[PDB]
Structure formats: C-alpha cells, structure tokens
Design a protein around this nucleic acid. Sequence first.
DNA 1: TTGCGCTTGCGCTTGCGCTTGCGCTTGCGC
DNA 2: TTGCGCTTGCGCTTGCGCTTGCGCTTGCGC
Lengths: 133, 134, 134, 139, 142, 142, 139, 133, 134, 134
Amino acid sequence: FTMLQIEFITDLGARVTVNVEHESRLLDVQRHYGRLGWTSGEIPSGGYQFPIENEADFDWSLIGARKWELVIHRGHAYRRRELEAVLPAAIKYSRGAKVSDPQHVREKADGDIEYVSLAIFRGGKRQERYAVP
Amino acid sequence: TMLQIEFITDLGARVTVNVEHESRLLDVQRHYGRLGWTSGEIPSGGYQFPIENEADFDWSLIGARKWELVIHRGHAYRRRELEAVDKLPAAIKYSRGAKVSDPQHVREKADGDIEYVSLAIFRGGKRQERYAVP
Amino acid sequence: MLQIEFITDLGARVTVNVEHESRLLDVQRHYGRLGWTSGEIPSGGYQFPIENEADFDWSLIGARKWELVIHRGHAYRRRELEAVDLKLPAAIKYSRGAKVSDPQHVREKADGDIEYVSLAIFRGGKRQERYAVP
Amino acid sequence: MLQIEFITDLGARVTVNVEHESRLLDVQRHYGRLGWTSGEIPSGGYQFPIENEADFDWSLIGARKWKEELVIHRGHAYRRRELEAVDSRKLKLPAAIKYSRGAKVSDPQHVREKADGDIEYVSLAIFRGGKRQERYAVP
Amino acid sequence: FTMLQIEFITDLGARVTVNVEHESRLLDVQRHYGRLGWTSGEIPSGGYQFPIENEADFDWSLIGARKWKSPEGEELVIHRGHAYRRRELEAVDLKLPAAIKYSRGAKVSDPQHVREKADGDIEYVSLAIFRGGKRQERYAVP
Amino acid sequence: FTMLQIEFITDLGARVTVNVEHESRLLDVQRHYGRLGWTSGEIPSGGYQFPIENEADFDWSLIGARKWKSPEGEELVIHRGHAYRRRELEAVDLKLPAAIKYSRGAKVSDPQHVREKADGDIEYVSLAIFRGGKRQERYAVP
Amino acid sequence: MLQIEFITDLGARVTVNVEHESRLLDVQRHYGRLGWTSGEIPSGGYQFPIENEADFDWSLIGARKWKEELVIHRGHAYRRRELEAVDSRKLKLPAAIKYSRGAKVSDPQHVREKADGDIEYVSLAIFRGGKRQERYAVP
Amino acid sequence: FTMLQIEFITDLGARVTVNVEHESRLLDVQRHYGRLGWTSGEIPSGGYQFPIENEADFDWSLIGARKWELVIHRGHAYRRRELEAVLPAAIKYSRGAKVSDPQHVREKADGDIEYVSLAIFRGGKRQERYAVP
Amino acid sequence: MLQIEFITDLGARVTVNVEHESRLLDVQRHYGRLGWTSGEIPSGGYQFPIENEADFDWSLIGARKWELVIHRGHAYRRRELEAVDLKLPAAIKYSRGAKVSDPQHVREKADGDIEYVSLAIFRGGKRQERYAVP
Amino acid sequence: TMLQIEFITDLGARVTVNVEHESRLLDVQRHYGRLGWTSGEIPSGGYQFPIENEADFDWSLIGARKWELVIHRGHAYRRRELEAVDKLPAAIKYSRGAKVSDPQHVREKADGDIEYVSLAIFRGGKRQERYAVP
DNA sequence: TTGCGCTTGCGCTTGCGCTTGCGCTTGCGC
DNA sequence: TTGCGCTTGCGCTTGCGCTTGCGCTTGCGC
Ligand SMILES: [Ca+2]
Ligand SMILES: [Ca+2]
Ligand SMILES: [Ca+2]
Ligand SMILES: [Ca+2]
C-alpha cells in the first residue's frame, strides 16, 4: 500500500515494469531509468505542458531525454524555440516531422512545414520537483 | 479485498497503485487526482455525468481542478450552459476549442469551422452522492 | 487466482483479484451492476446466440435495461431483424445512432446517410446458459 | 512463473498465472478452447508454417473448426482458401493456405485488404513456407 | 523490488509477462525469448535506431529477430514473420550520415501509419536503422 | 456585334447555345427558356447571392427554377429536379444580417464540394441566399 | 437558330447547327440514335416523370434498349429497378423506376452511390413523380 | 480575323458570349461588363498574380470586381493585406474561407484559419493596361 | 456544317469546321495523325467492339502504333484478357501503369498495389466497319 | 479553311480567335503566347516534348517565357537535368515547388515531403522543327 | 494471391487558439 | 430505395515556398 509499479519502454523498446518499494522515490526511479533513455507513457499531444519557470533547469531525464544545444528523446533531436509574447511567452521544443511520423503528431505550420512537439514551457507555476537536483 | 488502479501521472508515467479495499477506491482516486494524476481515458464525447451532480462535482475524481474554468492534463475547459429545448434536454458541458495538435478523433465539428474537444457533459441521469466534493 | 481489469463508472482502470475461476462471471455481474466494464465492445458489437436474447444478463457487460439498454452512458435501442428467404438469418440487434463524437471506426454506414454504433447482436449460435440472468 | 493476458468469450480482460513456462501452451489450449484469445490478430493474419496447416491446433489462438469446414474466431467465420504456388521468374508466390472472410460494414479500414472486384478481405491466418513446429499441432 | 517484469508477445501472438530476478539480467532474458521469436513492445516509428558501429554484430535476438540469407544472396532479417532487406545508404555531403537500414516493401495488410512513401510510388516499412551514435557493447552478440 | 450567345443546359441536360439579338433582351431570353427549366451556368458555391429586398417577388425563371408549395404548406423552389426549402434566418447582433436561404438536404449522389456540414451531422446544399445588398428591379417578376 | 454540342460515339466534341428551335428534339433523337450524347449525366441520374417511363425515347439521351431488357449508354449497361412506394408517415417514398449499374473500378468517387452490403451503384436515370411530357415519349 | 469572342459568367451566373469586332477593344469590353459584375474565366489558384506597382490604381472592373475598404467579387468581400518584405513585399486580397468553399481554394494558415485569395500584387513590372483609365 | 473541337499536339484548344457530316471521321483521321485528340478518354477507357481490335484505326482518337500505342505522349501496352467460364468475356485492353502525376480519378487499383490507367478496351459489341483503317 | 483557337488571356479571360488557315496556327499561337496567353491546360505530368527540342524550344508556344527560369502564368519553373541511368532515359524537366494554393491533383510527391508541380518534360521522342524558335 | 455480407431510421447544443525553419535515403509484393 | 463486376504486372528522376485574423445561420433523404 506504499508500493508502486511503473511501466517503462526501455532503450530497446521493451515493455518493462519496475517495482518501487516506497512511493516517494518515484521521481528518483524515473530519473534513474530516464538517464538510460527509458520512458514511461506517451508524449501528450502537443508535447508535455510544463510551467515556463521550469524551463531553465528542467530535468530532462524525468522524461528519458537528455541535452546535447539540442534535446534528444527516443532517438530524435528536438530544437529549442523561443516564442516571445505578443499570446503569452513560451519556450517550445520541437522538430520537423519525418516521413515516418504518423499523422496525429504532425502540426502543420507555415510553408508546408510540419512540426512534432516534445514539450512546451508556458504559464503555470514552477514545480521544484521538475528541476535538476 | 485488494484492488489496483493504474494512473497516468502529471509527468505522463504509467503507474499502478494498490488499494486495500474497494470502499477506499474513490478516496485513492481523489488523493492522486489532486496531484493531476488521471486514470483511464476521457471517453469519446467526454465523461457523461448526471446533471444534478454538476454544481458540486468533485473534479479531482478525474484528475481535474477548477480555476471559472476546469484544468485537466494541462488544458483549460469552459463551462457551457445548454438550455433545454422542447426536443433537447438541459445540459452543462465542459469543452475547449481544438488545438492544431488535437488528433481528429477527439475533434467535434461545429458551426463556423470551429472544432470542440469535450471533457465532460452533465446531462440527465440520477445524482450520485459519491461524485460530489466531500 | 485470476485478475480482471475493469473500466469503472468514472473511467478509472481498476484490476480486481478473483480467488476462484468459477466465480469469474459472478464478479463481472457484481461490478457490472455498478456500470463497470471490462475490455472493449468488439467491432460490430458483441456477438451472442439468438437464444440468449430474451433473458440476457446485461450486467455481464456493465449494461442495464432501462425499453432501452444503457452502456457506458449511451442508450441503445432493440432492433428485431426478421429472417429472409436474399438469405438472412433472424437477428436481434442493439445499436444507437452515431454521435458527432463517435470515432470513424465505430460507425456503420446505413441507408439515408445514417450511421449506427453497435453494442450487441443476438444471432445464430447455441444458447449459453451462463449468459442468462441466474 | 508467467502471466498470460486473455480476452474472454465475453470480451473481459483477464490475467492468468502459469506456475512454470513448460505449461504455457497447455494453458493457452485450455482457455482457447473456451474461445478466449490472447493478443491481437497480427496484421495480415497470423503467419504459420505450411506443414502446420493440416493438423493445426486452432485452440492455440482461441479458434475452432465448424461445419463446408469453417474456422470460427471471435464469433466470425473464416474460409479456407488454397493459394496455388506461382513459379514464374516474374512473380514467385509460394503455395499458401489462407483463412479469411469478406469484410463486414463493421470492420475498420486497417483490417480490410482490398482485392479484385471491389471486394475486401479480413485475414485470420496464412499457412506458408516455414518449418513444421510440432507444438502447434493438435496433441 | 530488485525484480522486473517484461511483457512479451510470443510467436503465437500471446501476451505473456515474464519475471526477471535482477535488472542486470534483463538483456539476457530478452535474448532468451528473443531466439524463440518473442518480442517486447512495438517497432518505434521509423524503425529502431541503433549506432552504426553496432550493425556488423548486432544481436537480433534482442528484438526477437534473426538473420537469414536468401538463395539469391540477399542479407535479410526475419521479424514477426516478415523479411527485411539490409540496405546500405551512402553518406551525402544536403548532409546525410552513412546508414544501414532494414526495411521491406509495404504489404496490402500494412496500416497507413507504418508506410513510408518513397520514389516510384513505392512504400517501405522500417524495422531498424543503424546510424551515427557510439557503439553500445551490450547490443552485440556475446 | 450587338448580338450575344447564351449557353443553356436544357431540361434534357443538353448543351444548347441560343442567339440573342440585343444585350437588352438578355434577361427576357433567360426567362423564356427558364420557364422550360433550362439553366445557364452553374449554381455558385454557397448558392446564388441576391439582395434581400428581391426575395418576395424574385423571378425564379431567371435561373430556370419555379416555385411550388407542398401539401404540408412548405414554400419550395424546384431547380433541376430538386426541391429547395425556403428558410428564414433571423438577424443576430456575433453579427449576422437577416437572410432568406433556399437549401435542401444532401442526397447520396451529391458530390462533396456542394455539401455544407451543419449541426447534427446534417449536410445542406444551397441554391440561393437573399441577403443584404440593394434591390435590382430587373431581378423581379415583371 | 440553335447550336447543340454533342460527344460522339468516338468521344469527339462536335457542334451541330439547328435552323429552328422546333426541330431541337428531332436533332437530339437523330444523333442520339447514333449513340451521341449532349451534356453530362446529372448527379443522381436524369430525373424524369414516372408516367414517361413506359414509352420513354432513350435516343433523347443517346441511350438504347437491348436484350433481360437493359439500357445501354456510353457503352455501359443499366438495369431497370422498380422501387416500390413506401407510404409510412415516417419515410415516405414515392414509386420510382431507376436505371443503375454496379460501380466499376474505373468509376470515380463522385458517381458512386454507397448502398447496403458495401455495394456502390452508378445512376443513369430515375423515373418518379412529375407530370407526363409527351415530347419525351417515342414518336 | 480581327474579331474576337469573349465568354463571360454574368451577374446571374449565366454563360454568355460577347462578340468584339475589334481585338484592341478587348479591355474596354472587359471593363464595360466587369462594371456589371460579369467575370471571364476563373480565379487562378492562389489568386490573380499582378505586379506590385499595379496595386495602387488597379482597375478592379477588369476582373468584374469593385471597391467598397474592401473588394467585392462575385458576391464575396475580400480584405486588403499588406505583407511587408522580410520574402519580397506583397499586397494580398483575401478572405476567410466559408463552409461552402471547396477544398482546392482553401489555404491553411495559422490557427486553423483558412483563406481564399482573390489576388496578390507582387514583383513583376507595372503594366499600364491594368490601371484605372 | 459541323464543328469539331480538338486538343492539339501542343495542348491548344482548336475548333475545326467540317463542311459535310460524311467527312467527320475523315477529319478526325486527318488531325489524329498529327496527334490531335477530341474530347476526353472515357472513364475505364474507350469501349470498342472486340471485332474492331485487330485493324482499329488509332488515328481516330489521335493515337498511333509504335508493340505499343502512343496517345498524348503516353505509351499503352496491349493486354489479352482470355475469357473464363467466374464468367468473363474475352477482352483486349490497352493500359499503362499510373505515373505519380496521374490524378486519382484515372487510377484503377489492382493486385500488388499496382494502379493502371486505361486507354481502351475491345470487348463484346458488334464490329463497326468505319472504326477500321480504311 | 478557317480555324478557331480558344485562349486564356493574361487576365484569365476566355477568348476565342479566328485563324485563316491551319498553316498559320503556330504563328497565332506564338503571337498571343508572347502576351502570356495560353491555350488549353498543362497536361498532367507536364507537357511531354522530345528531348532534342529542349535547347531551342519556342516557349511562347505555350504562353511561357525564359528569364535561367521559365515563367508561365505567373509562376517560375526551374530547369532540371535528369541524367540517364542504365534504366531511365535522360530528361530535362521544368518544375517548381508546390505552393499552399496548388490543388492536390497537380502535386507530385517527392523525397523529403517536398511536392513538385511540372510544367514540361523533354524526354525521348523525335525532334519537331516547328517547335523551335524561328 | 482470397471471390463478396449485408439488416438498424437519426442526435444534435459549444464560439475559436494561434507561435516553430524543414529532413530527407530504400526499389516493390503480390 | 438499387443487390454486385471484375481481368492488366509497375515507373520512377526534381530540393522546398512561405506571408493573411476567421465567418458563421438551415434540420435531414432516403
Ligand atoms: Ca532546485
Ligand atoms: Ca437458466
Ligand atoms: Ca495611367
Ligand atoms: Ca473494311
């Protein structure tokens, strides 16, 4: 009743369940396996929605991503995009769609270009839990 | 009689939790719901709840929170009062405009080339006390 | 020990432990009365023997009679499809008209630009006694 | 110990515990005889070795034979079709035995295979090539 | 709590969960049921992505696949009953790294989301692409 | 050189060109073959657009149409074998002028480009909408 | 004087001069007997009065009857179908006689009418309602 | 051999041919009937392409349109849009798509908005023929 | 006097005056030799009697033999379709594979994800002598 | 023997012109072509011309002009040299990137989610002297 | 690669969210 | 509204053009 299981997709695509003895260690477990490129769950449509004040020091390993100035996630490179307010300000991580990207993740934009979003940092209130330790 | 419930956390992670007894299920739903965790998918058309549950509905049951808007999985939904016609019954709907990222299967086409995405509709039915804020 | 995974009345994904396989159906009846369902409606609707239609236990699939069948917040209507002899067997179908929120894959195109969504069809087969209200 | 997840004859999602892996196929046969299935029909149908067709144990995929000899699976009827080898240098097609049915109005697009004469088929299984697996046959 | 579970789809398509005693043993369990043609999870869109230096001695049993040479001399990989051709894609410098791609032509039964439209009205379906990165030794045949 | 030609589609669908002696006689020629149900050109997308003050006494023969009241009391217009209902659309002030629209439900044989998706999964096909503008007297019944 | 534009039996776009409008239908019959057509099949098929069906002059649309009694038009065969009136207060359907064929692989989507059983039909003409037009009948 | 016919769609949608005795009067004939709202031919996909130096004094009656600050054409209102160079400078006339507009004329742009173009004024060299007399 | 409208080898739309109807076909032959065509290829291709295939005058439709048929810059291949007796008449078809520039409405879907574009089919009917090379 | 040719003018107007004799047709095509008038449509895939006509092709024949680009109906097309492969024949293609306004039926899908619109391809065939600049 | 299965009367409603420089490749399976 | 018609072996290629504040409505035909 304090125990928890989390289901990951590994670096090799495998569906693996990890047992967490203590609930409160959940984020540590996500960080641990995230550093190995394991992910849990799916990218929400439109990308993860995070508070804008979380962007500067976001722990990318939480979603199994890493910095490289790019963000690599499940073998894809995402570019950082600064969207000045005009519309609230936002910082978006996205990439150009690939021929293999299915329709439902493609976002049509100017010039017949399509984007695929990993995350957008905008609004909300900072959650210290999301930052690098 | 132990139960398990599967959640999607605020970070999207798929996590399973144990529950001692079925009578505690809703309490566990509210606890994790308050952190923005959700269990299951928004059904097509949105959740269908009894209209007499709308005024005091415990939104944490589905991982949602009031803000006069409902926030659910990073999205804001507006309250829409749909007056009965006599034939359509009265209804209170929570829905948002479609975003470029919303997949086709959740988009409801409306007048004026506007598409809506539904979170919930409170309509008809019989009030369930357990759905209200405690 | 078996485990059965339900979608609850609130859409939550909950797993129930069942001590004895002989109880499996009793457990589905029990929670089905609360409107919990397990698994998905098969494309075309569930397929049951026609000799099970008159006394079918709808709680087995989380539905209830109301003269309509209510399943996951939708009302389905009873449809007597007479046999023909160009050669069609008798059948009793439960289906509703498609809503704007119904996704393409559940819609069945019909005469007059109407689309139906199917819950169940009672056709042919051999009567299974356990499907009946005990 | 293994666990296998079934969809019952009532569509319910049920998990079974299997004490040792050597009993895996026994447990699959046992519940498959009850019409329970585990997993989805792979796109194109299951692919099995051609020399497994004659004595294939259909309960392994929760199907059964019925009398024309049809295979019943999830309340649908599938027909046995002999696809004769084509030995041209152009189109080489190996012998196959395919179990498929005409598409219904309720079948979604992703299971429909478009064919000659505006007909669509839905595949359950194809038996072709491969090498016989004894454990697939009826015991 | 040291233990893991891994979900496979067996050679008969069945959804079977296996217990693993220690995290360190994960890849070995995958190899074991992999040789039986069991797979875990889905082919990622665009195929698995592996380091180019891992291609020569990649352990295909990790993803439930096996190598097979055609009578015509084709280098093939068999995964879930489908054959994928080994394709050498030369570097271009338009900048494109060298790559080794495993893909097959689309079949009538392939859903749209796995089809990659290519030249001459051909559609390809990807299993894997070996490209860039740095070599992970654990990925190799032992 | 004072002369014009007008192309009609007859009641039998035939493509027939008619000579007109003077420009001034154009609308009268249209009325003449219009009464026979001959039409010229296509229904514009969204239906013809006419001034609202022209609706009450519009000469439907100008577009090869005719009025017809149903036994249920419906005000209808018949054009190329189809019936279009008269619909009164009240002003809204979201700003929308009052309008009188002639439209029918889509048929199975109607191509996609003429269908206007509306509420409740209904599709409408438009003949004409009377809305705004100022009255042209030539449009009226003489 | 009128001009009528035909599509010949060879598909050619040919314009004919007609000295006086009273001869219009005569000229339509004359070339229609040669299989020439003028204009397109209206969507849904031509719509003609029901009491014109029995003695309709098919050459008016460049069609002809052939022996089952079929109508041939642009090298396609159309079947006569009697659609019996439905007099319910719910669905009121007048008697009709429809000439239509099953859709071919070459028929584009805009002529295909989707029906029961995944069948598509292509319409040539429907005879229903209206009032008899004598000039439509065979002379 | 100096004669010319021009085919118009009238204000009532009718397909009418006008005989022009002298070729050189073609533009006068277009202006004359254009003032009555008659048009000849179709709007090219993407709108008519005119030289940017023709925009200030363009004779809208040439394409059967008129000013009203809007341009009315075949019963539709088009808005003038100034697109500062960044991309050459351009002046576009377009409107929001209507529910009745067929797919092939709709131009998807930001925010699920679709536009329908009448004309774009850009590049080229001024043609005095196109200006108001 | 008749008028016939051609699309020329340069795609130009040109109308030719024909003094006598009896000459109509001779005029189509004349310009067809220059690769001018009149009207459109009917959906499914032209339909001619099977007894006209062996000596068909291709210039009538602006085509020429080259063993292929060339029409408007495309090569079409001859296709002997044997009769069967489930019941198909004999037929000789002229068609080519679809190009990436071919629009959807001319494509005929076939086995192996191949699409064909049809020029003509010689099937049934009764031989029309005027269709032949004179 | 009088002919008529139908043009789309630089303003899009549909105009018909008379021609005294067929031998003057191309001269009339060039005259009006020089003003940007076109006759007929660009065929699907583009005009198909003989490769040995490319170097000195009279673009005014189709209402086009050189500028190293070809301008046609307000659009600019690039020359693309497609080397033979041995099996593909050599080819010189004039095509532009698709615009948001280009309808689907003219768009040719290529590598990299790029779509092309073709004006013309010079490939194979036999040189026609009358197609060259005089 | 295959020959083909179906049937039913219908449910609505709402104002709208936006942004980004783009990634390619392969021969093909009936 | 209707019962159903089919067949064929396949042709490729190219670097890319961009922009805009948005218009609604109707009950439905088999
Ligand atoms: Ca900190
Ligand atoms: Ca009993
Ligand atoms: Ca001036
Ligand atoms: Ca002869």
